[PDB]
Structures are given as structure tokens and as C-alpha cells.
Amino acid sequence: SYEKIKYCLVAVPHGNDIASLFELDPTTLQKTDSFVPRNSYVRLRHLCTNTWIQSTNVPIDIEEERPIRLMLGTCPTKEDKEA
Amino acid sequence: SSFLHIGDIVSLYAEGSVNGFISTLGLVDDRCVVEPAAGDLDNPPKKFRDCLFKVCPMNRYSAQKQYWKAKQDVVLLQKLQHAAQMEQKQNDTENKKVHGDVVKYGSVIQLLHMKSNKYLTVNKRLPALLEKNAMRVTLDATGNEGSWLFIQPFWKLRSNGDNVVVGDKVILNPVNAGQPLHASNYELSDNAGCKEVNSVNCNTSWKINLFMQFRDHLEEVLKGGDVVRLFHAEQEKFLTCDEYKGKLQVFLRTTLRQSATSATSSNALWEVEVVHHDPCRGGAGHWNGLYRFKHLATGNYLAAEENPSYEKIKYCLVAVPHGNDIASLFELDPTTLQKTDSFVPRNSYVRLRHLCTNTWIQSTNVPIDIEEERPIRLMLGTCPTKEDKEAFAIVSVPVSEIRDLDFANDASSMLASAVEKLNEGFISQNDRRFVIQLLEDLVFFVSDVPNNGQNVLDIMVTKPNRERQKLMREQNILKQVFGILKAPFRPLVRLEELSDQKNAPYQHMFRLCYRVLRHSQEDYRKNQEHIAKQFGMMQSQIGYDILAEDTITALLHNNRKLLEKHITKTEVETFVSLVRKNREPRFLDYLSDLCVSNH
Amino acid sequence: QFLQKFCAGNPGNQALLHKHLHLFLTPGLLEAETMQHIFLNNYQLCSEISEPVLQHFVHLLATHGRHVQYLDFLHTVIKAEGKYVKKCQDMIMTELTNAGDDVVVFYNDKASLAHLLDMMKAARDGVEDHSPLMYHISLVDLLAACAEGKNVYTEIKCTSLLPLEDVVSVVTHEDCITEVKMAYVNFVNHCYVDTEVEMKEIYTSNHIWTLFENFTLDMARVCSKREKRVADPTLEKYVLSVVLDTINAFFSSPFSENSTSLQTHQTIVVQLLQSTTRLLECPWLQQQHKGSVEACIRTLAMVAKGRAILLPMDLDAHISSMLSSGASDYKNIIEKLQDIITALEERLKPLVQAELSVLVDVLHWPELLFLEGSEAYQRCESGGFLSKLIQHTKDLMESEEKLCIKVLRTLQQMLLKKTKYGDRGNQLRKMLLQNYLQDWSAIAATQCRLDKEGATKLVCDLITSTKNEKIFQESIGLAIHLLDGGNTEIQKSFHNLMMSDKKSERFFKVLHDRMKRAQQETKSTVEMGTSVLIMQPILRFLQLLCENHNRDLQNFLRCQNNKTNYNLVCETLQFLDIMCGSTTGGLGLLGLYINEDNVGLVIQTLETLTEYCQGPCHENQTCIVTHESNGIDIITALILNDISPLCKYRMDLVLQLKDNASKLLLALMESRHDSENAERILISLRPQELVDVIKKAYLQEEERENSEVSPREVGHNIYILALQLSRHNKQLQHLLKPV
Ligand SMILES: O=P(O)(O)O[C@@H]1[C@H](O)[C@H](O)[C@@H](OP(=O)(O)O)[C@H](OP(=O)(O)O)[C@H]1O
């Protein structure tokens, strides 16, 4: 249905395709590009599409009592409030 | 990316109900307003000097507060004063010691306004003027204990104890009030399109936009936003821009004074802008960088345009209303051999080059105003070749002059609006009240005496301020004052009916105007001659209680030339006739003073 | 209805019903009525009321509907036995503001004002027992009660909700009932005339004068009705109670001096003065109401004299004359039983002490009860009963608070010196001990044995995790008793536990949180609040830890190896600075902050600071000397500036304060050769004043008659302080040289 979410996160059976490649963008200022510290906030971006993952408040399972599943999307813009 | 540091100059951008930078109304107003229509992050407001705040550490005010309350026995007062001075000294050294320290979330910081040198504070006791629910936020010179503001995360990504990063959205929570700052949606009646800032529970987020770093804030280097004037060493003239025939033109003003450097002018003040990728960011200037020059008096940007007649000057310097175009970009070429391309030293000779055209600015001896007596405006041109005999010294400006210019510019703009409103025919009670408030403020400005409730109309000046008087004349405010006198008596108000209580508010306004004229001229020949040029209007209005006679006597008392030229038999006839009608001894005294001048 | 009558006027039944409070915490008008009756005229229950009750009531009002039973309960909760509860007012106001506009409804719009008038005329005869009109009246009264307390934000919010113009417009209408008029007047009195907000709009405005002339009209109608025998009790209460109070509040305030400047205000003031003059003439007024009327007349009269108001001769003479006049056998059995009860209680009181003292002695050596050679005897010989007591005390903390408190008190008595109860008590103790069971060194042995059992661990566990003030206080007392006499074994045990235990961070945090609360309470004092009393035991416990020159313990008090360090050393210095007034206190106004009550605590703080420095530890000395609170100046001011107000009736306390201050300063630089400490103290000190105070101490032999600490001794200590300082200051060395 396209909404502000142009692309939706989904699970693919095979990861050999480039569509499963992701980079990590640090939230704070790290020392050059050294090892990623454990327990650190990161932002996920799609290499193939060059988009940043965003969270949406549209439940996937709308047709049930008290939906608990929330769709995750990607947008070209960067949202610094999400990590 | 960089971390926020104490002493950095940053602009706060409120995100929420209203999206805009936080600024303050000019003049003496202490209110803070967020203007959504002024601009956004991509396009900062034209007057960005009001949105700049410096971050300072905590400054204790317990000793100062105890002094102030006690003032508002003698030995005790002196002891309190010594402590307050000691406390002020202890604070001053602490800020210097803490300078350069990183700012961490959950810490207390103070925001200081650069233009007004006033701390942004919150008063819990007094509610906001517009939104009674919220508390009051205002700018205070010394700053009370409410200046302290906890800087707290707005994102869940940051946490208490984390260093504040530039561009992070933060919440400023006052220590005492306990309610975060909030950009209200209540439009201010005084100024359309301006909102209000008050302390109340909300979801507003303030984004930290960096303008200049603490390291680059050195006073020995040229920095973005500095108020400097360009002095032509070869011709010993100051760069200036003025309105000649309905169009603003740039030139070099010829000065008859023996010392050219002393010919300081309010219209010769320029502001240096460092152009970077980020419009909000400023910072220090480099030799290889690009600069923009802005006229503080008007706000136009210096640039070059095709010469109508071409002469050796292919392109002539002119002022353009908007500086976004590349035509306003200029480069600085050092005259001496400097160390690589480091910071431009303050008070150093430089040559201006046009990036778009790749030409060097030159001075020409062809006056712009040829059709006038003793022309004083000289055209400035540009040529492809380089002339090593010409440069532009960057002379610094004191803080007092820039503050006065901002006051004069703001006062002139409102007076022009008031003149237009009066010329239209109808003015509301609120508008005339604001005009009266502005007039008395101007009267205090020219007089310079502290405001302690004394009547403005009855005030004396021991030593007139020459600088303010010159600013008063140059900024055309006296012309606005003359317009305020002319338009109403053209009818909205009639002189013969002024005695009626219905017209009483107007009488006070006219009285204030003459006080400005009287205080504007004192021991200055140029102001006296300029005011005396409209002798007809003042003479016609004599007889009514507007203090017109007092201004005329004061102006002509110390000037023999004007006294002989203007006072003919007609004025004596008017004075004696008024004496007969009133039989008031005051008029006799005025004639006696008129008879003898300068003893 | 039976329940409400049962708990009517007797707090005992109210507490008894409150025991099963959770029964009534359900929606229902009857339940709310019972809740209101239970919390009626009971300060203890009202002050002890917890968040859930108030939150639940606010939720019901927001959701269940607009009802008055909730407001009635809230109103009784705020006021109990004639004294307001600040906590309840703040909590109620915060909940009302956060709830939204559903709970709080104010009719301010033009349509709303018309709606008010339409109901107001409908209920002209009277107010129904269940209607939105009285819901608004109760809300107005509730807000006024909340604004009565000292809270600037609460008054600002209340002022915003009901502006001055709205009150004038509603009251001035001819179709207005007395109930709303009295409520609005009370609200104005509690918010506008009496307020901490600097705006003070009421004192400078023309809106109030409309109320004043309306008040004059109301009084005129009241007296006319009295003459016509049409008296209405509601109106009589209105004019007598709130109208007089509002008039008194305005015209007795210091901001009203400039309020009355115009002729119109002057005439209105005259109208009020003559109106009350007519009111006092009538005899129907009672003595209780006469006093209020006379007070208003006196306040009005003095205002007239100050402003030189002009009044008609006839009433002016009458007012002056009135002012001058004012200036110039079942009962036998019941009583007999009461005396017998008192006599028996007094007679048997000494024996209870002996009976209780048997418990601790039994706990000392439980072995004797069990037969020799049995398993129980062996277990009791090496810990056993006592060991389980300490271990299970931690477990029962949540199960029974009283049992743990009693155990701790019993343990404290175990670690305390025995006392002679009396002849009868001694005989009972000896008889009981024979029936059952068949010195500093002793105290030290007892302390070591309890530490072996786990008393130190128990005290640490109790302190770090506890939501009960009494348990925390008892644990501190037990620690002080354990460490009394400067026992090294207990001090080492505390050090080992703090290092090994991972919860020592919570221990330091709670002490830090407790310390700051004391400073805030001390700052707010400008009798003693609960925080400051619990301050002293913490300082005593810390001092005992650092007793006998323990360097490592002193270092851990300053800073530790954990992630976030709390420096307990400077908290005492800050507290002392605020207690004495800080900078202003040391600027010659020292005597204006130290009272007879707080001398003891100040001495404890100074003594604790001295013990910290008397390591000799350099880190503590520099930390106190270089602290930003500038506590050195006040410390010096103690020696220089004598506490004159206290010296008038108690000089020994001043001398003790001087002695402790001198000792602390000596310890600050006792073993320091650097001039940084000497430079800072010298900057705070004045060499000329030091020689003067030394001279006064030498000549202060007059008060030596009744001085426990000789003024000569403290003078010599100050001299040694001066001599130590002369090494770095040339000027002080010169004066100190005698001729
Ligand atoms: O000492 P006097 O008689 O006042 O003369 C001053 C000066 O000699 C020039 O006439 C003029 O400077 P420029 O011609 O260089 O402007 C200046 O006005 P100014 O204040 O407008 O410079 C005068 O005030």
C-alpha cells in the first residue's frame, strides 16, 4: 500500500541476496571506525535502497483483540530519535 | 560531529506546537518570542543575532539575593555589599576555570543572550503575561537563582551522565520552577506572528544548533557576526551606504575633519558573515574562506552590478536586498605575508575580491552626487587587474555603539509605522499608547539619565551624549519625529481643540516629541541647523501648551547665526501678541533670554 | 448509617475501622460517605493517608461522574482538628490539574455565565442537596483550601482558573445566592489578598471596589432585615464571617497604603466605615461576632487616621467615641476506680523495668536453661539462639515491623551498661534470675560477641533495604552502641563488610539522600523538622567509625572505589553552613541563626569534622579547606563573632561552640606544611580580629565562674592556631610578638 512507509521490513529465507545487507550508524561520536562496542546504540540502514529503518504505530494484526504486532518500515530521511 | 562545551554560542530551535528559533523583542523588552514564520533550520531568520545564546556554568546568587532583599544598619549594608562583590568575583573566576568543560546530561547550565547580555531566567512567583496557567520567562541582566536550567535528554537514546552532542534535542528544566520551557501558541498582540515562551509541562523539544565554538571565540581573530567597519587607507575614508535619490548606494564619505579615523558614522557599520555549508553554523574566518558583508543600519548585502556607463569601472559596488545570491560572496586577500591560511587577525589590512566576477575592488574619484554642492559621495568600482596600493582596514567597533544602533533602528522602524498609521487617518488607543511609550523611551535614550520614575518632560542633562545625538540625526528618527508633528495637524487633531480632555493623550505625545527635539540638540551646531530648517512649522504652533516655545528658545539661545537669521519682526509680533493674550510672566522671561545670547 | 454513627467523635473507632479500610475502597456513594466520616476530625489519619486513596477518589470523580461525596471526603482530609495538611493540599491540587477539565469545571464563558444565572434563579429559594450548583460551590471551597497553604504554583493555578473579572461579574449580578457569594469571597480572600505572588493585582486594581460597594449593600440589607424581622441566618453568617475577613485583609495589608489614593476609593472607604458603624449599633450581634466587627472597625479607623480621610461630623464623632470606649453512686465508683488504677500503675511501674531486664540477661546466657551435656547446651554455648536471632531478624523485616523493632531495642539494651532499678526491682530481678538461671571490658566483649554473631551484617542489611523510619533509626542506634568506646574490632568489621559487600553503594546513597533532605529542611526553616533530628545519629555513627585515628575509614567516607562516589565529608560542612545561614551568617549575623535548640547538633557536626581531619589525613583537610561552600568563613566567624543572643542566657554553650571550632581549625592544618591551607584560612580570617578575640578570651575570666570549658583554654588554642598561621603570613607574626 506504499502510507509513509515506502519499504517494509520482512524476513527472506535466503540471505545470499544483497537485500539482506545492513550497515550500522553510531548514535554518538566514536573513535574513527574501530570495533563496535558491545551494548551500544546503533541505527540500521539498507545498503541496496539507502534508507533508514523507522518504527510505525500501524498494527499488522488489526483484525484481533488488543493487537501486539507493530509494523516496521524504512524512509529515505534519517530520524535521530530512533536507534 | 562535536560535543557541546561551556562557552559555546548556540541557537535553540523549539520543536513542537510552534517550530521556530527563540528570539527576543528589541528595545528594552525582556520577553522572549518564537517566530514560526521568521525561518526554519534550512533558512535561518535574517536577524540571527537575536537567536544566539552562550552556555555558562552555574553562578550562585545567595549572597547577591540577600543584598538585594535588604536594600529593597549602614555597617550591615556595607558588609552585605562586600560579600556580594566577593561572590561576584568568586563566580567570575569559576566560569573562567570551568571554561571548556564538556556539558553532560542532567547538569545545570545558564543561557546568556549575546545581543542583550542578559541571562534567560524563569520567575516562579510571577505568572506569564499571556498564559496565566504557565510561569513567566524573561531576560535578566544580573540573573537570579532561576537562571539555572537542567539540561535533560529528550530522546530515549541518551541517558543521564552522557555528554551533550551538537544537534541533540534536549529539555531545559529550571531548577526552581520545575516546569520545562514551552513555546506557547498565544499570538502576541503587540507584534503579529510572534509567540510566547513560558515554563509549563509540555512535550516541547529544544534542538542545539552550533554557531561558534569556545576555541574560536578568541577576541584576537576575525569571527562571523563581528561588527567592523572597512577603512580605506589610501583615501582615508570609511565605507558607507546611504539613501540619495530613493535608492540606497554605497560610496566613500568625504570627511572635512582633520583626523579621518575619528569620522565614525552609524551608516559605516558592517557585519562580517562566514559562509559555510551549514547555514546555522558561523565560526571564525580563514584567509581562503568566503565572506559576506551586511549593513546593520539597513540589512542589505554588498555586491557588484553592471556599470550603466561602463569609464574604467566595469562593475560598480551596490547593495542588494537579499544576500543568498552568489553575487554577494567576497574573498579576503592579505596585504602582508601571513602564516599559511590561519585565522584572520583582527585589525588587519585586507583586499576584497568578487568570486563571481573575479575582480578587485577599486576606489574612483568620480562623485555619485555631482549635481550638489560639495559632493561627498565617491563611487567604488572593480577592475580585473590588482592594485596593491589599496586595501580596507578592519577597524573594530565598541559594544556600546552596536547596542545604540539596534535601539535606534528599532525605534525608527516603529516610528515610521506610527507615522504611516497617523497619515492614514485612524489610530487606535493601543497604538497611540505604544507610540507614547516609545517616545518617552527615546527621550530617556537621548538624555541617557537613569529611569527612576522622574517625569520625562522635566529632566535636565549635565553632559549631552554626542554619540547618541549623532545617531539620532543619522537614523532619520528626527525626521520621523517631525512627521509625527506634521501629519496629525493636516484632521485627526486640531490645535485649537487640544485643550479638550478628549485630546489630552495627543498633547502628551506632542510634548514628548518636542522633548526629543530639545534634547537631541545641545551644544551641537549640525543638529541645531537641521532642526531650525523647519522653523516655519514650530513658529506656527507657538502659543499652545506643547513646549514649542521652550524648544525654540533653547535652540536659538546658543546659536548667534540662527538667532539673527530666523528671528525677524514677525516672531516678535507673535511673542508680544501671545503675551497680551495670556498675560503670563513666562513669555516675558523667554523674550528676556532671547534678547541676550551667550551672555 | 450505623458505621458512621459508631465512628462519630472518637478517633479510637475511626482507627479501628481504618484497619479494614480496603473494604470501603469501591465505587459507591454510601462507601464515600463512610470514608468521609472515618477521616473526620482526625489529624493522625489525615496525615497518614497514602497516595492510593486520593488517586482512587480523583479517578472516580473523573470517570464515575460529577459527584460531591468525593469533594466532601477531600475537604475533611485537608483540614483536621483545625490545622491544615500541606502534603494533602499539594497532592490534591496536582491530581486535579493532571486529571483534566472533567474533574475541574468552571463556568467562565458568556454562555457559561448565562447558564450559571439560569440555574441560580432556578435555585433562588435554596440549593438542592444534589445538584451541579453545589458541586461547583464545593469545588470552589476545595480550591480555596488548597490555595490556603504556602505554595506559589497552587495559588497561580487557582488564580488562573477563576480570574478576578469573573468573580466580580458573577457576584455583582442581582440574581445571586448567598452560598456562591460566600464561596467566591472566601476563594478571593485565600488567593488574592493573601498571596505570595508578586503581581498583587488585587491591591492595585478597580475590580475590588465593586466588591466593596456590594459588601456595603449586603450589610445594609442585612441590618434592614434585622429591623424588619426578616433575618436570614445564611446572610448573617456571610456578612459576619467572610465579608469582615476580606475587608480586614485588604485594609490591614501594607500594600493597601497606596491603593486608596483617588476620591472615589476614599468615598467607598467612608461608606464601608459608616456601614459597619451602623452594624455595631444593633444589639442582636453576639460577643463572638462583636470582636470581629470591632477588629474591622479598629483596622478601618487606623486607616482613616493614617490617610487623614474626611468624614461627616456626625458619624466621625460617633466612630471616635466608640473607639475611645473600646480602648477605655456511679460517679463515686468511677472516680474511685480511676485513682486505684493510677495508684496501681505507679506502684507497679518500677517492677516492669526489672522484668524486662530479665529478658536481656536470659539472652546473654541462654545456655543455663538447657541441661548440661545436651545438644542444645552445646549449640547455645557457641552462638545458636543469638545467632538465629540475628539471622532471622533480617527475614522478618517485611513480615513484622514491630517484632524487628523490639528485637533491635532489646539488643541495644544488651550493649548498654546496667542500672540500679530499685529495691523492689532488684529483689524481683534476683528472684526471677534464680528461678530461671541456676564495665568497659565487659561492654567490649559483648560488642565483639554480637559482631561475631552477625550484628554488623544485620545492621548493614537493615539500613540499606528498609522503608520504615523506626527500623532505620534503631539500626543506627545499635551501630552506635556497638561502636561506642571506639572499639577497633567493630570498626574493622564495618570496613570488611563495606569492601566485600556490593550493596555498600546503597548505604552511601541513602545516607547522601538523607543528608540532602536535612539541608533542604534546614534551608526551609528560614519546631525542628523530622529530617534534622535523624541527622544527628548519622553523624554520631560516622564519628564512631572514624574514632581512634582510623585513616582508611576516613578515606572511604570521603571517596570509595565504587562507580559513583558520595563524599560524606562535605555534606556536614554544607549542612553547618546552611544551619548558620551561610554567607550572611558569617557576615556578622551569626547570632540570628543559632538558637538554643540547635547548639547541640552544631557541636556534633564540628566534632565529627574534627575527627575526620584528625587522622592526620591530608585528603580530608584539603577537601574541607578547598570546598566551594566557603564553610571556613562561617567556622572562623564562630570564633570571631560571639553569639550575643545565646550568651545572654547561656554562655557555656557558646564557649563549647568556640572550643569545638578551634579544635577543628587546628586539625585542618595540624600536620600540613603547605601554605594553601594557611592562605585560604588567612583570607577568611582577619589577623587584627584574631589578636582581639585572643585578648578578650584572656580577659574573659569574669564568666569563668559558671563555665565548664574555661575561656582561657579556648583562647590558648586560638593562639596556637594563630602561631601556626604566622609561619606563612608576615603580618600576623608581627602583631603576635608581645612588647
Ligand atoms: O565642530 P563643528 O562646528 O560641529 O564641525 C564638525 C566638523 O568640523 C564637520 O563639520 C562635520 O564632520 P563631516 O563634515 O566630516 O561629517 C561634523 O559633523 P558630523 O558629526 O556629521 O561629522 C561637525 O560637527
UniProtKB/Swiss-Prot annotation, chain C:
Binding positions (Ca(2+) 2): 547, 611
Sequence positions that bind ATP: 661
Alphabetical keyword list: Calcium, Calcium channel, Calcium transport, Charcot-Marie-Tooth disease, Cytoplasmic vesicle, Disease variant, Disulfide bond, Endoplasmic reticulum, Ion channel, Ion transport, Ligand-gated ion channel, Membrane, Neurodegeneration, Neuropathy, Phosphoprotein, Receptor, Repeat, Transmembrane, Transmembrane helix, Transport
Localization terms from the record: Endoplasmic reticulum membrane; Cytoplasmic vesicle, Secretory vesicle membrane
Keyword Protein transport carried by entry: no
GO cellular component: apical part of cell; brush border; cytoplasm; cytoplasmic side of endoplasmic reticulum membrane; endoplasmic reticulum; endoplasmic reticulum membrane; membrane; neuronal cell body
Example GO BP: memory
Record has Phosphoprotein as a keyword: yes
Post-translational modification: Phosphorylated by AKT1 on serine and/or threonine residues.
Role summary: Inositol 1,4,5-trisphosphate-gated calcium channel that, upon 1D-myo-inositol 1,4,5-trisphosphate binding, transports calcium from the endoplasmic reticulum lumen to cytoplasm, thus releasing the intracellular calcium and therefore participates in cellular calcium ion homeostasis.
Pathology linked to this chain's protein: Charcot-Marie-Tooth disease, demyelinating, type 1J: An autosomal dominant demyelinating form of Charcot-Marie-Tooth disease, a disorder of the peripheral nervous system, characterized by progressive weakness and atrophy, initially of the peroneal muscles and later of the distal muscles of the arms. Charcot-Marie-Tooth disease is classified in two main groups on the basis of electrophysiologic properties and histopathology: primary peripheral demyelinating neuropathies (designated CMT1 when they are dominantly inherited) and primary peripheral axonal neuropathies (CMT2).
Oligomeric and partner information: Homotetramer. Homodimer. Interacts with TRPC1, TRPC3 and TRPC4. Interacts with TRPV4. Interacts with SIGMAR1. Interacts with PML and AKT1. Interacts with IRAG2 (via coiled-coil domain). Interacts with CABP1. Interacts with TMBIM4/LFG4. Interacts with CEMIP. Interacts with TESPA1. Interacts with TMEM203. Interacts with BOK; regulates ITPR3 expression. Interacts with BCL2L10. Interacts with CHGA and CHGB.
Protein name: Inositol 1,4,5-trisphosphate-gated calcium channel ITPR3
Included range, full protein: 1230 to 2074 of 2671
